Amino acid sequence: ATVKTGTVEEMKNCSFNTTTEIRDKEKKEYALFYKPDIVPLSETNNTSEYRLINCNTSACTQACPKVTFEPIPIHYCAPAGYAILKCNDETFNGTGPCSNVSTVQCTHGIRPVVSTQLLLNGSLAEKEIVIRSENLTNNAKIIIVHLHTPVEIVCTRPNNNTRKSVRIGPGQTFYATGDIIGDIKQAHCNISEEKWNDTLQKVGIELQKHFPNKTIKYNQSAGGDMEITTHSFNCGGEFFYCNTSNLFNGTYNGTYISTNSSANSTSTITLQCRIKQIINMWQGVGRCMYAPPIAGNITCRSNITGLLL
Amino acid sequence: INCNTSACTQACPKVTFEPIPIHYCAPAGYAILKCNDETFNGTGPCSNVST
Amino acid sequence: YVVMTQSPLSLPITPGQPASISCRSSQRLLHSDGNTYLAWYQQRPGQPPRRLIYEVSKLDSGVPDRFSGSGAGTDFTLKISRVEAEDVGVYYCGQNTYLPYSFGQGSKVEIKRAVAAPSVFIFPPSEDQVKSGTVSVVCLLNNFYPREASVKWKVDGVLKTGNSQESVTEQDSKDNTYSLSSTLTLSNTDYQSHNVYACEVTHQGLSSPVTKSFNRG
Amino acid sequence: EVQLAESGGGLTKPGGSLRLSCAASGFTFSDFYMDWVRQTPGKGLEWVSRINNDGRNKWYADSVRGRFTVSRENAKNTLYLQMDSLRAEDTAVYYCARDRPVYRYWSGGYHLDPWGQGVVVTVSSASTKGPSVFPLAPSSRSTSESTAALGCLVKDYFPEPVTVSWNSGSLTSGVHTFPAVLQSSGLYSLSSVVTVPSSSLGTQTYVCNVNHKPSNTKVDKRVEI
Ligand SMILES: *[C@@H]1O[C@H](CO)[C@@H](O[C@@H]2O[C@H](CO)[C@@H](O[C@@H]3O[C@H](CO[C@H]4O[C@H](CO)[C@@H](O)[C@H](O[C@H]5O[C@H](CO)[C@@H](O)[C@H](O)[C@@H]5O)[C@@H]4O)[C@@H](O)[C@H](O[C@H]4O[C@H](CO)[C@@H](O)[C@H](O)[C@@H]4O)[C@@H]3O)[C@H](O)[C@H]2NC(C)=O)[C@H](O)[C@H]1NC(C)=O
Ligand SMILES: *[C@@H]1O[C@H](CO)[C@@H](O[C@@H]2O[C@H](CO)[C@@H](O[C@@H]3O[C@H](CO[C@H]4O[C@H](CO)[C@@H](O)[C@H](O)[C@@H]4O)[C@@H](O)[C@H](O)[C@@H]3O)[C@H](O)[C@H]2NC(C)=O)[C@H](O)[C@H]1NC(C)=O
Ligand SMILES: *[C@@H]1O[C@H](CO)[C@@H](O[C@@H]2O[C@H](CO)[C@@H](O)[C@H](O)[C@H]2NC(C)=O)[C@H](O)[C@H]1NC(C)=O
Ligand SMILES: *[C@@H]1O[C@H](CO)[C@@H](O[C@@H]2O[C@H](CO)[C@@H](O)[C@H](O)[C@H]2NC(C)=O)[C@H](O)[C@H]1NC(C)=O
Ligand SMILES: *[C@@H]1O[C@H](CO)[C@@H](O[C@@H]2O[C@H](CO)[C@@H](O)[C@H](O)[C@H]2NC(C)=O)[C@H](O)[C@H]1NC(C)=O
Ligand SMILES: *[C@@H]1O[C@H](CO)[C@@H](O)[C@H](O)[C@H]1NC(C)=O
Ligand SMILES: *[C@@H]1O[C@H](CO)[C@@H](O)[C@H](O)[C@H]1NC(C)=O
Ligand SMILES: *[C@@H]1O[C@H](CO)[C@@H](O)[C@H](O)[C@H]1NC(C)=O
Ligand SMILES: *[C@@H]1O[C@H](CO)[C@@H](O)[C@H](O)[C@H]1NC(C)=O
Ligand SMILES: *[C@@H]1O[C@H](CO)[C@@H](O)[C@H](O)[C@H]1NC(C)=O
Ligand SMILES: *[C@@H]1O[C@H](CO)[C@@H](O)[C@H](O)[C@H]1NC(C)=O
Ligand SMILES: *[C@@H]1O[C@H](CO)[C@@H](O)[C@H](O)[C@H]1NC(C)=O
């Protein structure tokens, strides 16, 4: 798009012939694409020839622009002749008897937030950090570390994108990024590294109750695709993929001291984030879709997790 | 005229547009009432009524 | 567009005294981002401009603490708590809120010192010049204060104005006065046509018709 | 640090072309907008052009739009202004100055800070000449002062610089080499004066010593009653 550093070279500028409404007539047309959506065509001398990532697996639908992915809460309800029981007995371990129980015909409002490596906007544990796993003796089992207090995350795409519409055949419009207004700069997320560090102390202390006297070591995800190795969102309608390697770092001993002094400090840990538009949703090839771009710039204030360790 | 909006279907030649009469019916546990009091004005009480 | 304008032109001010300058744009300097992007620049004698005050009122790095500023909307001021010898030179306001970035017409800081009268002189053209197709008759006003001066040209008691080109010093480095030359550049005919060439003083101190003369050749 | 070096300055005929180069030192040159701003004895300051950090978007003043183009090579820490169709008014001192930063995550307000020391451009190729020089004689009624002024007139040369001094610079008593005028003739001129005791006239050979570097034309012009 303007050569230079991977902050700008994240965007290719690509052109193609496209079919107008008039079946015999093709028009030359152009768009910007994020590098992961694009793959180099073979059978050429390492040239400027490319294709979309999905043409050799499945034709993805563009998501209709009226459709909104926002996590509006769902209540589940029991049919007639059934009842939903729930625990009032909080700080529950996830199996065995609850001492304080209620019926409800409908659940509280649950948000269908889909993500990885963290949850977001989840309801908090009642009085303390709670650690749940189906069998801690087996490393195959996840450890759901349910938090007591909301650490805040701020995420943004600070490029000022313009949307353009490409007319394809009769009565259809593909949508693509036409231009970036003014400055480049990088998509990223910010967490107050003070509150995060305290939270990794407090998870240290509770996780040590199941692993007594041991020092606790956090680390980055081991490896794989972006979908495995990055945290993920849909802020506004963009499928961010953020590298968490600097976040799950350091090792913390049984001392678990309040190293964050009571005085003011402004240390923010920052995550740099890729973006994609063609997504093979929920590891499905036929589930795949193209998200249309969103004009302007994005900000996305949020409360974090019960960690998926 | 329509290539810049939507590709229209040919209506299948077996299909017929003639205005064959519909009767509307109330389901079980409901009833339709009508005026017999003709030269009705379109609102207010009707003086001669049938199910 | 944004026009700019500064109120004081000369600041003939004593070392140690406060001074201030005001600048008044045609349209408000507030940017959409919510800052206001005025700055004030000093140009010393013989140097590029450098920036003292910026983002309305912040001091730029390395600036002396005697500089300061204020304002709102269209109207802004630069204040100096005490002027000093190194403050001499031209100050410009400038705006960066809208293209084109634009500048005040300037204000000049000058040392104040006593209202010295000129030493006054005239020069007959040299014999090689006296035969040459154009002849510059010349007058000098020397080491006077303040800066503002000129000559009125005469010959034979006749007013002899025309090609009187003039030039002036900067403030004097030894006594902080100024000097002036005036350069009546006649044709050889118009020079030889008249005889008792005279230059009459004009100075903002010595405004009087003090005059020096010579008879031609 | 943050230091800017302009270079490439020269002389041309009107309608011609010149190129100015600004080289950037002690800052990350990929991360700034850069501006050209110029100075004349008439105007004081005038904005000329702005360029984006990656070179993409560019802006110019109305007085030079299309006539000039601005460019950069971030591989060299270097900015260039190409000037074409040069008018007489483009005769100015040109400065390079650093504007809005664009860091990784954020990009603040507009600036002109710091400034390079500038370069000179001259747009008039007529009458290239070494000076005429004349004594401004302390003669006749001018001799009868107690400490006479004597002077010199260096006239019709182009371009600058002339270098002018009294007795090869060894004399200092009230020396005023006046600021030069580029005259209606198309050539510069100045006068110089010095004040000395009136009996020392001729007793010392007072001299206006002159050189003109664009032509190497030089004159040790003696001045007398
Ligand atoms: C997410 O979290 C990340 C990481 O924390 C955030 O990214 C960082 O954001 C800051 C902005 O908050 C980035 O820019 C900086 O700005 C501050 C403030 O100073 C600057 O702004 C002034 C206002 O316009 C400006 O006046 C200053 O520059 C001028 O002034 C001097 C005066 O002498 C003049 O000479 C110049 O010519 C300029 O006119 C200045 O630009 C600043 O503190 C930052 O670091 C600098 O400052 C310290 C002293 O405070 C100094 O020691 C350093 O050397 C350095 O100069 C920086 O300039 C910052 O760069 C971002 N970081 C990165 C890597 O991009 C992000 O904002 C968060 N995002 C969200 C969504 O919250
Ligand atoms: C976690 O919880 C947070 C707090 O509730 C969530 O942050 C909020 O997210 C919503 C949705 O992104 C923001 O609401 C806005 O959404 C509209 C969307 O555009 C609409 O308008 C256009 C036409 O103008 C139309 O085409 C679209 O179809 C929509 O109808 C924006 O226009 C608004 O400006 C606004 O951003 C909330 O503002 C935001 N809250 C805060 C405090 O920022 C967060 O999304 C949750 N989820 C995650 C994953 O963290
Ligand atoms: C983001 O980009 C849009 C599209 O260019 C900008 O919107 C225009 O802004 C200018 C200047 O304020 C207005 O004159 C136009 O009327 C706006 N609309 C269009 C369609 O051009 C917007 O200002 C940009 N925002 C930022 C923060 O850069
Ligand atoms: C965090 O995990 C990584 C990956 O498991 C560790 O980094 C190296 O991993 C390779 C895997 O083949 C080993 O061969 C190396 O021995 C590891 N490096 C070191 C220094 O031992 C890494 O060790 C872990 N982090 C910490 C804090 O130990
Ligand atoms: C688009 O970007 C602008 C500029 O960053 C955002 O406006 C600002 O938001 C930050 C963080 O809250 C503030 O520090 C700035 O002071 C704000 N600037 C202005 C001019 O208001 C804006 O929120 C972004 N737009 C969206 C829809 O997220
Ligand atoms: C992208 O390439 C097209 C090719 O037609 C060109 O017209 C357009 O200006 C380019 N845009 C950008 C932002 O690179
Ligand atoms: C589709 O193309 C990509 C190109 O790198 C390749 O990795 C992938 O294996 C291909 N899949 C199929 C089913 O052809
Ligand atoms: C985030 O936590 C704060 C804690 O005061 C709360 O006010 C806010 O409603 C929470 N937001 C969400 C989306 O959970
Ligand atoms: C706590 O829950 C885990 C996971 O279901 C289970 O293995 C463990 O036996 C439970 N312990 C008690 C005392 O409930
Ligand atoms: C854990 O540490 C304490 C104090 O150091 C010690 O008394 C106890 O025996 C240790 N337990 C194990 C299982 O090592
Ligand atoms: C994450 O960032 C680190 C550097 O901070 C880099 O070494 C690593 O390759 C990145 N991993 C992913 C999954 O992007
Ligand atoms: C379709 O084309 C005709 C051409 O005359 C035009 O009148 C009509 O407005 C067009 N409609 C759209 C939505 O482009």
Side-chain angles (χ1 to χ4, degrees):
Chain A
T2 316
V3 198
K4 271 56 170 175
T5 306
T7 55
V8 51
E9 208 211 67
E10 253 279 303
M11 292 279 204
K12 295 292 180 172
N13 181 355
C14 298
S15 60
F16 47 76
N17 290 318
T18 196
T19 320
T20 69
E21 311 94 332
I22 325 300
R23 178 167 74 84
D24 47 303
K25 304 295 174 166
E26 297 209 306
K27 186 198 173 198
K28 190 177 185 184
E29 190 57 81
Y30 88 90
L32 304 187
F33 294 100
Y34 301 97
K35 284 201 294 177
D37 302 316
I38 297 296
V39 65
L41 188 70
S42 305
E43 307 100 63
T44 196
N45 298 339
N46 313 298
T47 65
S48 55
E49 295 146 55
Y50 292 87
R51 66 174 176 90
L52 272 62
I53 184 66
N54 262 61
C55 298
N56 72 314
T57 63
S58 47
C60 306
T61 44
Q62 164 175 284
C64 287
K66 69 178 184 175
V67 173
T68 296
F69 309 119
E70 187 180 6
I72 290 291
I74 281 174
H75 304 266
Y76 267 110
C77 300
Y82 298 92
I84 319 175
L85 299 176
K86 87 181 191 172
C87 292
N88 282 69
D89 191 2
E90 261 295 355
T91 312
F92 173 55
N93 175 56
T95 51
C98 266
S99 66
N100 191 344
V101 178
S102 305
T103 51
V104 296
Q105 204 67 31
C106 296
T107 68
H108 79 273
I110 294 169
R111 297 181 175 270
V113 178
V114 77
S115 67
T116 177
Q117 299 190 2
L118 302 179
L119 316 177
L120 313 94
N121 303 334
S123 66
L124 299 167
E126 193 67 6
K127 298 295 193 181
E128 189 51 277
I129 295 173
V130 177
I131 301 184
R132 310 200 191 88
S133 182
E134 196 177 12
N135 181 355
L136 281 176
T137 75
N138 184 359
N139 293 342
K141 300 303 186 181
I142 298 299
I143 309 185
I144 317 294
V145 180
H146 206 128
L147 295 189
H148 178 214
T149 50
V151 172
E152 174 164 359
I153 192 173
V154 181
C155 291
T156 179
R157 183 200 78 204
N159 320 129
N160 184 8
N161 284 8
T162 57
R163 183 156 78 194
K164 62 176 284 188
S165 53
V166 177
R167 162 58 57 73
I168 298 193
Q172 308 181 134
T173 57
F174 174 57
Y175 286 104
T177 300
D179 199 9
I180 299 170
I181 301 303
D183 313 298
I184 43 159
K185 49 187 177 175
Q186 183 162 37
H188 63 276
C189 295
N190 283 356
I191 299 168
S192 297
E193 178 267 340
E194 179 189 309
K195 311 312 186 187
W196 181 253
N197 189 57
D198 285 357
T199 299
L200 295 194
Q201 303 293 47
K202 292 179 188 192
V203 170
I205 298 157
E206 303 325 308
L207 183 57
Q208 201 192 52
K209 292 179 174 162
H210 299 267
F211 298 108
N213 298 354
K214 280 166 170 65
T215 284
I216 288 169
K217 174 180 294 190
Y218 302 99
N219 208 353
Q220 71 175 357
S221 49
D225 308 343
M226 281 178 272
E227 291 84 351
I228 292 173
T229 55
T230 66
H231 170 54
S232 188
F233 305 73
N234 72 351
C235 279
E238 294 280 48
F239 290 83
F240 285 78
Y241 288 112
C242 294
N243 182 6
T244 57
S245 178
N246 58 354
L247 185 66
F248 292 89
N249 191 29
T251 184
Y252 297 85
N253 192 5
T255 47
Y256 297 116
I257 290 175
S258 300
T259 190
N260 287 306
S261 57
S262 307
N264 297 309
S265 179
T266 56
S267 178
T268 66
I269 176 165
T270 297
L271 313 178
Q272 55 229 50
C273 306
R274 295 288 200 134
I275 298 182
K276 293 185 51 175
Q277 289 186 252
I278 297 180
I279 68 176
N280 286 287
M281 184 55 111
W282 302 320
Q283 318 311 323
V285 176
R287 286 194 280 277
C288 79
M289 86 179 196
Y290 170 93
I294 298 178
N297 64 298
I298 303 295
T299 55
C300 195
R301 310 299 294 243
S302 186
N303 285 2
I304 63 151
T305 214
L307 310 166
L308 303 188
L309 295 180
Chain B
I1 181 61
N2 266 42
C3 304
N4 74 317
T5 61
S6 46
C8 305
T9 47
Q10 174 175 266
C12 289
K14 72 175 177 173
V15 177
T16 298
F17 308 136
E18 184 180 353
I20 287 308
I22 286 158
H23 302 262
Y24 266 115
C25 298
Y30 296 92
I32 321 179
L33 296 171
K34 77 174 184 165
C35 283
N36 287 66
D37 187 10
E38 262 294 2
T39 319
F40 173 56
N41 182 54
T43 51
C46 199
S47 69
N48 186 0
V49 185
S50 307
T51 40
Chain C
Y1 184 88
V2 182
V3 200
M4 298 293 276
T5 280
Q6 282 158 242
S7 317
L9 271 54
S10 175
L11 299 105
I13 299 182
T14 309
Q17 295 289 6
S20 70
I21 298 162
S22 61
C23 173
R24 292 181 284 104
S25 65
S26 63
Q27 180 173 339
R28 300 178 296 115
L29 299 191
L30 175 72
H31 196 266
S32 182
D33 78 21
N35 307 272
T36 296
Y37 295 125
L38 187 135
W40 294 96
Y41 305 96
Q42 182 191 15
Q43 173 159 33
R44 279 182 293 256
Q47 288 211 335
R50 83 186 195 293
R51 192 174 74 166
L52 301 187
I53 302 301
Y54 85 109
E55 288 177 30
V56 193
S57 64
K58 299 189 170 78
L59 264 74
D60 214 327
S61 174
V63 174
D65 195 53
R66 58 161 170 281
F67 295 103
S68 61
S70 59
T74 47
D75 307 357
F76 304 88
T77 80
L78 169 68
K79 173 180 181 82
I80 310 90
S81 65
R82 303 188 300 96
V83 306
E84 294 283 16
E86 65 269 24
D87 303 342
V88 169
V90 184
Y91 295 74
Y92 315 100
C93 61
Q95 71 83 18
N96 305 107
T97 302
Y98 298 101
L99 300 188
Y101 302 162
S102 58
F103 306 80
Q105 84 295 2
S107 297
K108 194 173 294 180
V109 172
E110 307 184 72
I111 278 159
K112 197 176 171 78
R113 60 94 65 234
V115 185
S119 307
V120 184
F121 306 88
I122 199 169
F123 315 88
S126 58
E127 313 308 322
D128 46 7
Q129 205 189 158
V130 161
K131 69 174 184 184
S132 291
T134 57
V135 192
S136 301
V137 192
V138 184
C139 186
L140 166 70
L141 279 59
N142 204 20
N143 284 102
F144 58 77
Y145 189 90
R147 187 187 295 253
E148 288 79 359
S150 186
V151 171
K152 328 180 190 162
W153 276 97
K154 280 172 182 173
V155 68
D156 298 327
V158 193
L159 187 73
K160 193 64 162 185
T161 52
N163 292 350
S164 58
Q165 310 290 8
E166 309 198 305
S167 181
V168 294
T169 70
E170 191 35 60
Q171 195 163 23
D172 184 296
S173 61
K174 297 175 176 60
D175 78 2
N176 311 143
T177 67
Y178 310 86
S179 307
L180 175 151
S181 60
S182 189
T183 321
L184 176 68
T185 300
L186 302 179
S187 78
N188 198 263
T189 305
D190 206 358
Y191 176 65
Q192 297 282 357
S193 174
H194 298 85
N195 319 265
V196 189
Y197 282 95
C199 64
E200 174 175 330
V201 172
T202 294
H203 168 232
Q204 177 163 308
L206 193 77
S207 304
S208 305
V210 172
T211 293
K212 299 293 173 82
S213 66
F214 67 97
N215 186 27
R216 203 189 74 268
Chain D
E1 177 67 336
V2 202
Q3 174 64 290
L4 295 176
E6 305 93 337
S7 59
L11 169 66
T12 182
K13 60 186 174 177
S17 290
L18 280 168
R19 203 186 67 161
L20 309 185
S21 305
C22 176
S25 67
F27 74 92
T28 306
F29 182 82
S30 64
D31 293 1
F32 295 83
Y33 286 69
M34 289 300 299
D35 275 40
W36 286 99
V37 171
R38 77 182 175 186
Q39 170 148 87
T40 68
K43 182 58 181 71
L45 291 173
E46 188 196 4
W47 177 74
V48 182
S49 179
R50 175 171 95 178
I51 179 157
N52 198 48
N53 81 303
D54 65 5
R56 183 162 41 88
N57 291 355
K58 287 168 286 189
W59 304 261
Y60 313 92
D62 304 314
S63 61
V64 299
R65 191 172 298 112
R67 305 201 292 116
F68 297 0
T69 60
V70 66
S71 65
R72 66 193 293 156
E73 287 185 320
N74 293 352
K76 306 186 186 170
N77 292 27
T78 295
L79 171 76
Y80 319 94
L81 181 71
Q82 177 60 41
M83 299 202 292
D84 313 315
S85 306
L86 280 159
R87 295 167 182 172
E89 292 65 31
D90 297 315
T91 302
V93 185
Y94 286 75
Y95 305 111
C96 175
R98 187 194 66 151
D99 191 351
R100 181 154 174 271
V102 184
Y103 299 108
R104 184 178 286 274
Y105 302 127
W106 168 101
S107 59
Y110 304 96
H111 303 299
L112 294 173
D113 177 45
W115 290 43
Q117 79 312 300
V119 281
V120 182
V121 160
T122 310
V123 192
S124 185
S125 188
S127 63
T128 305
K129 162 171 175 56
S132 299
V133 188
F134 304 107
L136 303 180
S139 188
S140 308
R141 174 59 188 83
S142 194
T143 313
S144 74
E145 302 300 328
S146 183
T147 304
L150 70 91
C152 173
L153 167 60
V154 182
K155 185 171 178 284
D156 292 315
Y157 57 90
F158 183 94
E160 284 279 356
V162 282
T163 59
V164 182
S165 72
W166 289 99
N167 289 71
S168 306
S170 65
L171 181 69
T172 54
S173 304
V175 172
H176 299 283
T177 300
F178 285 90
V181 171
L182 182 56
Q183 307 163 104
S184 187
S185 63
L187 302 101
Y188 300 89
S189 175
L190 71 75
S191 299
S192 188
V193 302
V194 67
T195 47
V196 302
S198 299
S199 178
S200 303
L201 305 176
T203 306
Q204 174 168 2
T205 57
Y206 292 110
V207 188
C208 181
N209 301 84
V210 183
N211 191 346
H212 177 244
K213 302 295 190 167
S215 71
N216 308 312
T217 299
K218 59 191 178 182
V219 192
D220 302 310
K221 198 70 169 183
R222 176 171 167 176
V223 181
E224 288 192 322
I225 291 162

Coordinates of all heavy atoms in Angstrom, one line a residue, chain A residues 160-162 181-182 296-297, chain C residues 32, ligand 3:
Chain A
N160 N -7.9 5.4 10.3 CA -9.2 5.9 9.9 C -9.6 5.4 8.5 O -9.3 6.0 7.5 CB -9.2 7.5 10.0 CG -10.5 8.1 9.7 OD1 -11.5 7.4 9.5 ND2 -10.6 9.4 9.6
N161 N -10.2 4.2 8.5 CA -10.5 3.6 7.2 C -11.8 4.2 6.5 O -12.7 4.6 7.2 CB -10.8 2.1 7.4 CG -9.6 1.2 7.6 OD1 -8.5 1.7 7.7 ND2 -9.8 -0.1 7.6
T162 N -11.8 4.2 5.2 CA -13.0 4.5 4.4 C -13.5 3.2 3.8 O -12.7 2.4 3.2 CB -12.7 5.5 3.3 OG1 -11.6 5.0 2.5 CG2 -12.3 6.8 3.8
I181 N -7.4 7.4 5.8 CA -7.4 8.8 6.0 C -6.2 9.2 6.9 O -6.2 8.8 8.1 CB -8.8 9.3 6.5 CG1 -9.9 9.0 5.5 CG2 -8.7 10.8 6.7 CD1 -9.7 9.4 4.1
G182 N -5.3 10.0 6.4 CA -4.2 10.5 7.1 C -3.2 9.5 7.5 O -2.6 8.8 6.7
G296 N -14.3 4.8 9.6 CA -13.9 5.5 10.8 C -12.7 4.7 11.5 O -11.9 4.1 10.9
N297 N -12.8 4.8 12.8 CA -11.9 4.1 13.8 C -12.7 3.6 15.0 O -13.8 4.0 15.2 CB -10.8 5.1 14.2 CG -11.3 6.3 15.0 OD1 -12.1 7.1 14.4 ND2 -11.0 6.5 16.2
Chain C
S32 N -9.9 21.3 16.2 CA -10.9 20.3 16.4 C -10.5 19.3 17.5 O -11.3 18.8 18.3 CB -11.2 19.5 15.1 OG -12.2 18.6 15.3
Ligands
LIG3 C1 -11.9 10.1 9.4 O1 -12.1 10.0 8.0 C2 -13.4 10.7 7.5 C3 -13.5 10.5 6.0 O2 -12.5 11.2 5.3 C4 -13.3 12.1 8.0 O3 -14.6 12.7 7.7 C5 -14.6 14.0 6.9 O4 -13.9 15.0 7.7 C6 -13.7 16.3 7.1 C7 -12.9 17.2 8.0 O5 -13.6 17.2 9.3 C8 -15.1 16.9 6.7 O6 -14.9 18.0 5.9 C9 -15.9 15.9 5.8 O7 -17.2 16.4 5.6 C10 -16.0 14.5 6.5 N1 -16.8 13.5 5.8 C11 -16.4 13.0 4.6 C12 -17.3 11.9 4.0 O8 -15.4 13.4 4.0 C13 -13.1 12.3 9.5 O9 -12.9 13.7 9.8 C14 -11.8 11.5 9.9 N2 -11.6 11.6 11.3 C15 -10.3 11.6 11.8 C16 -10.3 11.6 13.3 O10 -9.3 11.6 11.1

